Amino acid sequence: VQKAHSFRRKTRKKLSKHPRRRGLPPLTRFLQEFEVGQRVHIVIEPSYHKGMPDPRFHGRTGTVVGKRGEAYIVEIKDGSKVKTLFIHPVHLRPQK
């Protein structure tokens, strides 16, 4: 039986957390800052449910191209299409 894709489809392990990492994460990831042109990895924090990108884009690396509110505008290349996402800094990590 075909199943359509939803936000939490097949995310039992991808969006799970380590048992020893249960609770609030350290505030550094929440309060980190980025600059235009910087490249950041998309690593979702399951506890924070706001500003979360689609899990299909988890683990990719994107380019910051602006900012709106408290969310960063991240551009990715899915195949040959440019996709723009609004991701909270808690779901982001600097490259290197």
Added chain:
Amino acid sequence: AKLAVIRIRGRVNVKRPVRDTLAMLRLHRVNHCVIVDDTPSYLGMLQKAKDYITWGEINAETLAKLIRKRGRLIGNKPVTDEYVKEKLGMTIEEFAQKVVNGEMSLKDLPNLKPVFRLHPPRGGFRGSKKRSFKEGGALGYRGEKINELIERML
């Protein structure tokens, strides 16, 4: 050091990744040889395409003979002692010696094609093209023994 790489197997039943690796190495057809460096990138490419090629270390004398006989310029023109002397100031033997030592590179000779189209070996290959050279085949790394094969293929 310098590595001589000769394609062994044909152009059929080849998957896109290995086909493109061979195209990048410029080994488009069978019985075609190229000379490359021993850099990690080239070693990785050789590992990727190791099931359709053979490779080894090339000696100065073998390289000199290869340039003298099967070397060709743009336009499929023969490479001659007069031309090499007029363009570099030394004979083929000295050019090959310097290239093997690593002082200079083949590209330093203008209008020299980077691929040598060899002749099928005399007495044929002494192993099946379905097995590696270590177990009696004609594929993969074979070390200094590639000089004998290059001599046979001219």
Added chain:
RNA sequence: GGUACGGCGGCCAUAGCGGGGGGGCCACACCCGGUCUCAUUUCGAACCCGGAAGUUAAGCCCCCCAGCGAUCCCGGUUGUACUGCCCUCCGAGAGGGGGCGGGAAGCCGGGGACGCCGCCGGCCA
């Protein structure tokens, strides 16, 4: 510059749990009393207001351990289990094997580990 002094943090167990010894210049506490501020779906138990008669008994601070938990290094099991590419290699089949490239988990033995580190201030000098 010292200090078995405190406040705000970083990594978030190699830092935890459980044990042993040591301390009260200042500082941190226990603690004396509830008119005023604040509160009990009763209780000044907590929270809050007012202080020093006593105490270092313990929170806290200094030092130590390897019982549990965690986790880093080395040696054995072991280049074992497993696996990427090629194969006119074997096997009735299941499945295995050769060449090149990767390579555990658990267990056993010997070490490590009872946390590092940053900004400022108090007291003394």
Added chain:
RNA sequence: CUCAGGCGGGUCAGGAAUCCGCCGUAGAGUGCAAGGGCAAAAGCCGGCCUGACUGGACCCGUAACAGAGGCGGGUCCAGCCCCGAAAGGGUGGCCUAGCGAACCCCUGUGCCUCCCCGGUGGGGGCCAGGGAUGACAGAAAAGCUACCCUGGGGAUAACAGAGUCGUCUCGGGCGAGAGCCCAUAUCGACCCCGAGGCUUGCUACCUCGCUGUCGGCUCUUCCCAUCCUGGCCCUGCAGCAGGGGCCAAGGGUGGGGGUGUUCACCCAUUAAAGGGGAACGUGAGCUGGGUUUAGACCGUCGUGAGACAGGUCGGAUGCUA
């Protein structure tokens, strides 16, 4: 503020009423399925409130890559507000389900408009909310055909062929046990390994611009896993006979009763009255009893036309090689 559960102690009070202390990483709870997340909370108990709001942008998903009406979600600007000391939080439910085009109609709210002009009644238009299509990207909708017709399909069934052998038939390994003792004279549990394509089934690979079915008669031929006929071995083989097994396919394996029957049952003989393959051999050889059209009767089901792998009577067989 901290749960489920457990331990020790308490008047009625016990397994379970209501309490007190300790252990207790969540083993509780969430409005609801499952997954994930939540412990000085997102859980429990309280105070206030309605942001479950108005005017709009950009983006992700349904629908990767790679097009989309509708729908859901995310990040924001402005307005008027809620909570809080403040930071900060609020565009419904901790995240993922609980729903839906065109046309038409109802409601709110302001504006535009109705054929030469002006007023009145009424109509039309723009924006927002609602009434449903579950076949859920949205026709309003019951059956028989055996009197059937047409266009196709071996993209797709029934017979046969092909693959497989679950099943069918026939062998083997081990040996618990039965056989006065004795496993193997004979039978051989519970388990396990195979052969054939002779029953049935599964698949849908060839054949639907046509390869005529079951049964019987006539005739030809082949396999052995042999019923008799030839020769042997073991025996719980005294003889006459039996049980098990081996070599062996030259010959035979017949006649009748009911039934369309193959088969099975029965009768009298016989050495025996073996099982099968050949397009389930053989309809350009025969017969046409059964099966499967068109007529008709009975039973049952259906309001009905009708239907029945339910009976029953009748129902064509082309040929100049």
Added chain:
RNA sequence: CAGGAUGGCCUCCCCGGAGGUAGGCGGUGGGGUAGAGCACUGAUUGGAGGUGCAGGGGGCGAAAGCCCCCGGCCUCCUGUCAAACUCCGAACCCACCGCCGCCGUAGAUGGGGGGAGUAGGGUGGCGGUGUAAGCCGUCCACCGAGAGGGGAACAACCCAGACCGGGGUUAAGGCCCCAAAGUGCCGGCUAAGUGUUACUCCAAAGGGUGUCCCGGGCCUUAGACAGGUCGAGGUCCGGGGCCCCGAAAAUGGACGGGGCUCAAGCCGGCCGCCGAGACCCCGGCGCACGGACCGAUUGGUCCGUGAUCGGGUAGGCGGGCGUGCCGGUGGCGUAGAAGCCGGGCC
């Protein structure tokens, strides 16, 4: 649902101007599969210890109660598991950055426009399902849409991807004859015509003092076994290679056939020789791109590069050949036009 639309994949033309990434090395991130394991959730044999636990049943006692067991629940030991378990966890895959390599100013990545075809796929490896065949996905290798040389023929397996005329060497594989190339060489094995099968086709459990060997043993050269006397090695066990039994079908017959036994079979190797349109060379044609020169309508001659051009179904694009008639231009024919039969040349 034998049919269509939007996309994906093909082709032709044009704009844009400086980059791009199929392969590889190193780095920064993501993962929870194979394997493994019990630290959670659910299963699981027995034993030990602790708990009266609504267990439950008996001894014991008018009754309240104790003493026995069995059961339930915890800790440990012991012996086992998981697609809807995970304290751990690869190979490997993906995103991004630097570089090597390759492609690109003879114009790529990218953008616009015109025309399609395609909506039954098959074989092969992997995953779920099924007794199996098969069904359903996935991998893009081969046929579809693919020539030539082999596997006896064979879609799919091996070599191999192909313009035309020649010469040579090799690939798959092959060398007793059919049939080009050895009755080739050394060491060993098989006695079964086993075999003469890379894969498309291939019979098992179970057994064999049948042979050739390896490794462990106990006795062990006047002493060990076969029958207290001889007087040289015995008696077991676990394995490896080949072979043997287990092994019955229908027209007469299948290692392709003949046939083959220190092989013409099988093992561990080796040496020569044959064998493709593949690889190399000579001459020729066309095509793509650039250049020079030259045409009064799309062009023509020549030159330079092509290891990185030459198979082809649906389909796209360019050139060319042929027929009737009309406006021009230049002509042929009764000394024989068109038409018709047989030949030469391009």
Added chain:
RNA sequence: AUAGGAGGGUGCGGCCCGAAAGGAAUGAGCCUCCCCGAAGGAAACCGCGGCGACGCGGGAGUACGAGGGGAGGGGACCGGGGUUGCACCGUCCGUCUUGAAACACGGGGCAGGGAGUUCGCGGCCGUGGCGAGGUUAAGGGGGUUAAGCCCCGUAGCCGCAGGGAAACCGACAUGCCCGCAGCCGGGCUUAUGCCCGGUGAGGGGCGGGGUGCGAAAGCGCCCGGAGUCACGGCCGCGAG
């Protein structure tokens, strides 16, 4: 009249034909000799290694080698064609289909006929005219054997200004930045060519502007002049 394959393919050999159009007495097949020769490529014999099949060094890159030339002798064939023989290879044509020699369908032979046509609208491209303009339609006059030919014909249609359902309102003739080709200057380069610095049409991007929704912000569409007509071609829709 002892021989097997869809009737053919490659090569040649018998028998036969062979004036013309093909070469050829200005020399054909043919015989002899000489020179250079790409890729490739032996052996006699000498020495050595190996148990052996055999190999290594010299001979030797020699003889030979596709082909490219020359000289001598002879004097009429060669190319081509019909049939047939030998060796090897080859299971017809069209079609649906994953799959055709097929026991799947259409296929006795020959000749003749036979199936992307026309109009309307629309999107594109190849070319030509004119150009902020383009272009006629019906129709009229002249001339003509004639329907050919010449001129007129601005009604009409598209474009020049877009936004909105409507009322209605109503825009850059360049303010600025990157920048290809071309141009200018400089360096290397024999030259080509490359590099560097400016200007840069066309191109891209900002800024500003009109209108619709709004309280505004902000967004959608649009704005710094290229369209129109004609011939031919591809395609979409409707007509058989």
